Design a protein around this nucleic acid. Structure first.
Ligand SMILES: C[C@@H]1C[C@@H]([C@H](O)CC2CC(=O)NC(=O)C2)C(=O)[C@@H](C)C1
Ligand SMILES: [K+]
Ligand SMILES: [K+]
Ligand SMILES: [Mg+2]
Ligand SMILES: [Mg+2]
Ligand SMILES: [Mg+2]
Ligand SMILES: [Mg+2]
Ligand SMILES: [Mg+2]
Ligand SMILES: [Mg+2]
Ligand SMILES: [Mg+2]
Ligand SMILES: [Mg+2]
Ligand SMILES: [Mg+2]
Ligand SMILES: [Mg+2]
Ligand SMILES: [Mg+2]
Ligand SMILES: [Mg+2]
Ligand SMILES: [Mg+2]
Ligand SMILES: [Mg+2]
Ligand SMILES: [Mg+2]
Ligand SMILES: [Mg+2]
Ligand SMILES: [Mg+2]
Ligand SMILES: [Mg+2]
Ligand SMILES: [Mg+2]
Ligand SMILES: [Mg+2]
Ligand SMILES: [Mg+2]
Ligand SMILES: [Mg+2]
Ligand SMILES: [Mg+2]
Ligand SMILES: [Mg+2]
Lengths: 148, 51, 167, 53, 185, 122
RNA sequence: GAAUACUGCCAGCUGGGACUGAGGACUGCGACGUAAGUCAAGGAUGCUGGCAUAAUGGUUAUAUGCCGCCCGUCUUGAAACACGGACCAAGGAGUCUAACGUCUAUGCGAGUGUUUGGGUGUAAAACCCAUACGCGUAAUGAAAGUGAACGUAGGUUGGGGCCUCGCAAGAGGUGCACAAUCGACCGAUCCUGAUGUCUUCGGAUGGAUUUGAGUAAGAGCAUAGCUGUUGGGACCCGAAAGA
RNA sequence: AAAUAUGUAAGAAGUCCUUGUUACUUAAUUGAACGUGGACAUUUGAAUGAAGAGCUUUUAGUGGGCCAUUUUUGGUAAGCAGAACUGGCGAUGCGGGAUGAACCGAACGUAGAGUUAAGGUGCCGGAAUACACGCUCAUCAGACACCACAAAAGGUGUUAGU
RNA sequence: CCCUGAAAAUGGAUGGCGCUCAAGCGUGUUACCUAUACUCUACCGUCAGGGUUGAUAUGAUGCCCUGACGAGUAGGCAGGC
RNA sequence: GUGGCCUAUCGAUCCUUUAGUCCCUCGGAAUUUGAGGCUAGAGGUGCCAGAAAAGUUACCACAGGGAUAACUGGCUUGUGG
């Protein structure tokens, strides 16, 4: 709302807060990123190092769907089981009846290992799994069933 | 609410310093000193008058 | 509504006054003002009149009877700051002035209804004035020229400097 | 000075309490009696100007 | 004239009231103003000052943080106080029975605390049962974990995060960031 | 402190106060610094409330702790607010203040004459 | 042997003049009094007079004493022999938008965002909603890739608040946020290379004056506001030119 | 080989006594660095002050300067051009210097009373045609710093002096 | 100290008048004059530190106590018309 | 002993080229050329934090500048007198 802006407060004061000497002009240093290598060099090199030049190799026609792989840690792994059964599965850890988790159905590509799942065996179906995550699952008594 | 100076307003001067009553009752501000007959030495007098 | 309202109003209960530590002590008159002193009136309708100081009233007013038989000033009160006490003194241990006080000079209760478009002296004052003034005259006549001095009116001459005049 | 301060406090813990460790600035001098006997004051006034060239 | 050693008419720089218009928060501020004045307990003063804080200065406190604070010895029976929001945390699988007093509880946090056998409490009931802050434990959330803090102090060799919109190769990973392209920061 | 005075000499007049000067200064213009505020003394209980740990129970005790530079001089002196003096009643006595007192001016050390100057200044 | 000058002190007495009277029950420090009281002791009372209206006072015109250069602007410096302004009315210049930084408010919070769209409606409103999608909850590397607990999620130093003993002084204990520091973990770089074997694959363990915009009991998402940024006619008006 | 200016230290993050860690170090159970435990008391190790102390984010204007004392370069010099420290003006009125950006005094809410600064007190003009000791007589006297200039040289004018 | 050295152009400047045991020059002692400076008091505002609930006390963004402070272009922010 | 006794003796981005790892990629799957990457040097910007650059205008134009010359005034007075 205009009634709350400093434009209202500047009425009656000549320069509108822009100074009498500097005298607000159109584009005193250039337009956009003009002078990034010449007279804006200090700002560019201090606040945006790495701006100029080429690094790496090109990828013609990159489809981001090829690289689709959401990651899930083991601490959030038990959140995929609905809460109506989470407590029941958490108690009475059975080798003959273990919860089956379809992480792909939950929308995850790779299971990672941020750690400390309870010692309750589970079946974890995943496309990709990290080494430590699979060790931690097998330590808890479960197994990883690779799926596609 | 108002600063009342001592050295006037003997009520305030007596509120502070209760000894001021004894000081007035005995005129300690005008005490007479004991007479002493101790003369200066001749070497002091001669040095003072020396050119 | 043309003006909205004030949400809170001041209380109309008047506040009492804090107890005031100012006591009324008697006025300490000047040294020169002693009974029987001839004063000179500096203000009023009787300006420049030599008068005889007779009594100190309780309202800090001097009861003077500048002898009516001599200069025509009655028994009346004056303010001590509007007189000049002169060195000349007259005896007053033949007169009584204890009757004259504030209630004696209580004037009137004028009414607001009363108004004056264009335009007597109380009885008791005349014999009081005569009785007081008799012994004043008897004392005055003991030494010469007081009657003439009281009759004469004081005034300032050319070059008369009151800051070095001895009264 | 740290070692000396520890030594002073160590002695004061047994005898002579209030050893007053802190340094103090140069204090104003106290009273004294300057004897004249054998030291009679004697000095003259300023001296006249001389060319010395 | 006066030789001013300090700047004149300088505001304290501290909040003396919440910046908000929440009337329930202002009632809480009024209650803890009275308590911070008529009680000498420094708990009421700390709670009162925390009641003035902004959102970024009141980070949420997870139930896992509360459980870790309750693992401290002598603190099992204490009353945890969070001047702010208690959020939920699924990383934990056990929760001790305890009393938590907070401004706001998320639905998950309140459910987890109540399911653990405990109770969620407001700061006014906290004031009623612990007027002097008896056996309380004030918890605060991580303030520098904020994403804005990553970019504070940007400069050469400071090791801070640039203010950037697109991330990846071609976005500020070239001259100035590696020796092979000019220099490195 | 003597080097401090030797360094601000062209801007101050200082000297050796007497008991009468100190007593009249503290009685008439003595204000205490209490909780960062300038409080008129006016009472022994205020001085005892702020200097009672140092054994200073009254204004006379404060005056003695000033005239004789006691152990708690620094605390008593800093408790005293800087005296705000008026201009001297009979003037400074000199045509021009900003010469040394020895050179017919006003600044510097005027050791025993500071009493007459301060008395006229308050 | 005195006096006096000079300088200094008195919690010695006293005369004249001037300005001020703030507060508004009481509380306090006191003083004089055997007490009971009184007072000049945390800010003025008492008495009296005149007028009760243009008298005081306000406004206005004038006079008198003293002072006072024309504003705006650029500028080190303007009353300038610098520029714009004869006068008046009306109009007349930091806006909106896309994206965004810091701060603040609000909702919900490991999530968050209904409004592309569907449903419905008292019909451009209000109300209701699925699946997705964006951002976030994982980083690092050019990339192929790999991907976060040795330990009460570490030790040390401080650290608010809390607990215990304490009348207090203090002493212990616990110590969130935050700061400093030594570690651990993940990715990159360099190195070491176990069992095994399509004998060239695999990469277990162990390291480093290396490196990352990382982990180490999540803080974000959304809307709104001031301020700032960029592109836009871009605060308003203004070329010589080009097509 | 000064003066002025300039670095550091004046303790609790300290000191001392034992004995712990290590892959570094020593011939070594030697050190180095970091520690456990113990001891040091209220002057915890000069003075004065401290107006709260630390810390962080974000953003405006500015990026022509000029003056004075002192130091100082070029120049015959300059109200010239160029540096050093400090104080100012710019951005600032007020009293004084008649007048004046900067000099002296002093920095400013609205009033009252008192006292002063710098500067003054014949009259303009508020305030001594004050007091005291001298000097000067100019047919171009002189009369307050910045500052609105004066020199080499000369005089039985007059005064003091060697 | 005074005099000579000492010449510029409209008429003019110890500020002016004037001033000669000065109203000049050197020095000294006093008295006096007056700034928006200093001291005290009131009022306005700002900042700071505090008091106030056995129903406040009236709405505690209120009432109150205490102390200090106040120049300002460019510019920033606040409260208002 | 990690060039010259010390204090000077030199050079970003893009591009090209070489060396190193014999490593990564050419995205339907392979092999071999070819190409592209990662780490480290060189090829050069002397206006040396680094555009690729001839004049004239008295036929001239615009925005400005007393931030800056040419006439007057002011300061100075070498030179002139
Ligand atoms: C003179 C020659 C070329 C020069 C350089 O590539 C010139 C330019 C070319 C260009 O269009 N853009 C740039 O950023 C650089 C370089 O490196 C030298 C060693 C060799
Ligand atoms: K002021
Ligand atoms: K051309
Ligand atoms: Mg205008
Ligand atoms: Mg601005
Ligand atoms: Mg302008
Ligand atoms: Mg360039
Ligand atoms: Mg006087
Ligand atoms: Mg005028
Ligand atoms: Mg102008
Ligand atoms: Mg001119
Ligand atoms: Mg112009
Ligand atoms: Mg015109
Ligand atoms: Mg016009
Ligand atoms: Mg208009
Ligand atoms: Mg407009
Ligand atoms: Mg335009
Ligand atoms: Mg063209
Ligand atoms: Mg400029
Ligand atoms: Mg300017
Ligand atoms: Mg002049
Ligand atoms: Mg000076
Ligand atoms: Mg006069
Ligand atoms: Mg302004
Ligand atoms: Mg290449
Ligand atoms: Mg100029
Ligand atoms: Mg010549």
């Amino acid at each position: 709302p205009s009634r709350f802006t400093k434009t209202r407060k500047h009425r009656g004061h000549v320069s509108a807060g822009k100074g009498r000497i500097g005298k607000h002009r159109k584009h005193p240093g250039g337009r956009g990123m003009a002078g990034g290598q010449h007279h804006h060099r200090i700002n560019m090199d201090k606040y945006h190092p790495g701006y100029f030049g080429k690094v790496g190799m090109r990828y013609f026609h990159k489809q981001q769907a090829h690289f689709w792989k959401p990651v899930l840690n083991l601490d959030k792994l038990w959140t995929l089981i609905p809460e109506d059964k989470r407590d029941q599965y958490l108690k009475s850890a059975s080798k003959e009846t273990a919860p089956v988790i379809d992480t792909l159905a939950a929308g995850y590509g790779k299971i990672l290992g941020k750690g400390r799942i309870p010692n309750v065996p589970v079946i974890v179906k995943a496309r990709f799994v990290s080494k430590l995550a699979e060790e931690k699952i097998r330590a808890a008594g479960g197994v990883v069933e690779l799926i596609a | 609410v108002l600063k009342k100076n001592p050295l006037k307003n003997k009520q305030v001067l007596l509120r502070l310093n209760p000894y001021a009553k004894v000081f007035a009752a005995e005129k300690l501000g005008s005490k007479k000193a004991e007479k002493t007959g101790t003369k200066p030495a001749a070497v002091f007098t001669e040095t003072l008058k020396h050119d | 509504s043309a003006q909205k309202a004030p949400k809170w109003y001041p209380s109309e209960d008047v506040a009492a006054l804090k107890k005031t530590r100012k006591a009324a002590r008697p006025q300490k008159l000047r040294a020169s003002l002693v009974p029987g002193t001839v004063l000179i009136l500096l203000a009023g309708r009787f300006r420049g009149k030599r008068v005889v100081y007779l009594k100190h009233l309780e309202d800090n007013t001097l009861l003077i009877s500048g002898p009516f038989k001599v200069n025509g000033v009655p028994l009346r009160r004056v303010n001590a700051r509007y007189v000049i006490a002169t060195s000349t003194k007259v005896s007053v241990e033949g007169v009584n002035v204890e009757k004259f006080n504030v209630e004696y000079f209580a004037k009137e209760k004028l009414t607001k209804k009363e108004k004056k478009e264009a335009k007597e002296i109380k009885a008791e004052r005349v014999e009081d004035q005569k009785v007081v003034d008799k012994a004043l005259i008897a004392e005055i006549k003991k030494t010469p020229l007081l009657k003439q001095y009281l009759s004469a009116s004081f005034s300032l001459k050319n070059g008369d400097k009151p800051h070095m005049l001895k009264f | 000075r740290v070692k000396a301060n520890a030594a002073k406090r160590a002695e004061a813990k047994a005898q002579g309490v209030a050893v007053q460790l802190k340094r103090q600035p140069a204090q104003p001098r106290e009273s004294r009696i300057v004897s004249t006997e054998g030291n009679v004051p004697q000095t003259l006034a300023p001296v006249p100007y001389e060319t010395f060239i | 004239g006066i030789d001013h050693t300090s700047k004149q008419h300088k505001r304290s720089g501290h909040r003396t009231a919440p910046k908000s218009d929440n009337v329930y928060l202002k009632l809480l501020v009024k209650l803890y103003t009275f308590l911070a004045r008529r009680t000498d307990a420094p708990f009421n003063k700390v709670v009162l000052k925390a009641l003035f804080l902004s959102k970024i200065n009141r980070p949420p406190v997870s139930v896992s943080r509360i459980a870790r604070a309750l693992k401290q010895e002598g603190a099992a029976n204490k009353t945890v106080v969070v001047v702010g929001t208690v959020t939920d945390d699924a990383r934990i699988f056990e929760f001790p029975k305890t009393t938590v007093a907070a401004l706001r509880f998320t639905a998950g946090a309140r459910a987890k605390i109540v399911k653990a056998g405990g109770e969620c409490i407001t700061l006014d009931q906290l004031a009623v049962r612990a007027p002097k802050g008896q056996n309380t434990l004030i918890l605060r959330g991580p303030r520098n974990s904020r994403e804005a803090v990553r970019h504070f102090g940007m400069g050469p060799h400071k090791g801070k995060a640039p203010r950037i919109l697109s991330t990846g190769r071609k976005f500020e990973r070239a001259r100035g960031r590696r020796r092979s392209k000019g220099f490195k920061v | 402190t003597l080097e401090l005075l030797k360094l601000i000499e062209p801007y101050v007049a200082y000297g050796y106060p007497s008991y009468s000067t100190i007593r009249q200064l503290v009685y008439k213009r003595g204000f205490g610094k209490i909780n960062k505020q300038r409080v008129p003394l006016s009472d022994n209980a205020i001085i005892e409330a702020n200097l009672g740990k140092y054994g200073i129970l009254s204004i006379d005790d404060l005056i003695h702790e000033i005239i004789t530079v006691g152990p708690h001089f620094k605390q008593a002196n800093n408790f005293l607010w800087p005296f705000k003096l008026s201009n001297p009643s009979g003037g400074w006595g000199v045509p021009r203040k900003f010469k040394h007192f020895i050179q017919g001016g006003s600044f510097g050390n005027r050791e025993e004459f500071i009493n007459k100057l301060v008395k006229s200044m308050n």
